[model samples]
Target: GSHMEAVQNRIVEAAERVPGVRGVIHLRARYVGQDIWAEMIIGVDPENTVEQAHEICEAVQAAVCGKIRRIESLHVSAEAREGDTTKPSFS
Candidate 1:
């Protein structure tokens, strides 16, 4: 997204800055009007089991979802840790 495209003519001192995400989560964001819609998909640590998937998903949900408004939907898909269980840092 270019900060200078929309304007007709000016000094065009615009500098576009793309933000990066931290942690093991991946996010896609779309800006519409004054509102923002966001979707986040994450893979939980290997310690997460299928039985624990629901809890882990929602826990992550509340943490991230609350930060943004008008989220398209909080879609989370995490698999049950199959074998080794070494977790990644979510921070």
Candidate 2:
């Protein structure tokens, strides 16, 4: 379990370290050709403007993609956190 768990934690940490990312709710990785396609849902301050949220998504995507070379591409989306209930998960 620690194998996938370790990979999931690494990805979440990469996303959360982005300046505006509050947390990551879900993450998934799939093989594509010779690389991995990663996707994650990230939470941000609900008060942030749409523009700010978009930038945060980009930053998270960049951070994770840069941290893991196997992750050749990433898709990140922003969610408004209503509470601290998100438990990061992987698939």
Candidate 3:
């Protein structure tokens, strides 16, 4: 769908602007007759906390929604890369 494409493009563009963002992957599934649903897996600097990651993802999601029309919802998640050894600075 054109709206979906526009929203996705905005997500990528906004995600790239966030500091410490490593990459963004869009995971989507289309059920037999249902609309497409997508989740974003945003990679961030190894030292970033889960809370910080969520904040960045939310910012990207917000930017995309603001730029695109007809977008009612979005889901965003974040995770550190496997083998990343950076420990949380606080507790």
Candidate 4:
């Protein structure tokens, strides 16, 4: 639906502006328990360690939630683009 796409764009646009965001944000919007949820997987630069990733993940979530308040929740996670930074994150 266009609504979902629009929601995704909003989430992406807001998150991209945050400093922790790097590469691209792979985001999708879906109905979870009859409400919209933004679940995004973002590639973070190598410089961001676990602490940095955690810090920025929360910030990114806050930014997205602020942009689109109607959203039920945000399941945002960041991955370091270098080496073995990829992990199966919580949904």
Better of 3 and 4 by TM-score: 4
Best by lDDT: 2
Query: Which runs of model 3 end up more than 4 angstroms from their true locations?
Result: 1-7, 29-37, 81-91
Model 1 residue 76 lDDT? 46
Model 1 agreement with the true structure over 31-63: per-residue lDDT tens digits: 576554555444544565665656655665565
> What shift in Å separates residue 40 of candidate 4 from its native position after superposition?
0.9
The weakest ten consecutive residues by lDDT in model 1 span: 8-17
Over the stretch 1-91, how does candidate 3's per-residue lDDT look in tens digits?
A: 8755655666677666776556664444232333334566766765787788778888877765566444455687776743244432111
Which structure among the candidates has the greatest TM-score? Answer: 2
Tell me how far candidate 2 lies from the true structure as C-alpha RMSD in angstroms.
3.0
- CA lDDT of each prediction against the hidden true structure: 0.40, 0.79, 0.60, 0.72
Candidate 2 structure, TM-score to reference: 0.81
Q: Which stretches of candidate 1 lie over 4 Å from their true place?
A: 1-22, 70-72, 79-91
TM-scores vs. true structure, each candidate:
0.46, 0.81, 0.61, 0.77
What is the per-residue lDDT of model 2 for residues 1-91, given as tens digits with 9 covering 90 to 100?
A: 7755666788988887889877787778776776777778988889999898999998888888889887777889987874476544321
Counting clashing residue pairs in each candidate, in order, gives 0, 0, 0, 0
- TM-score leaderboard ranking: 2, 4, 3, 1
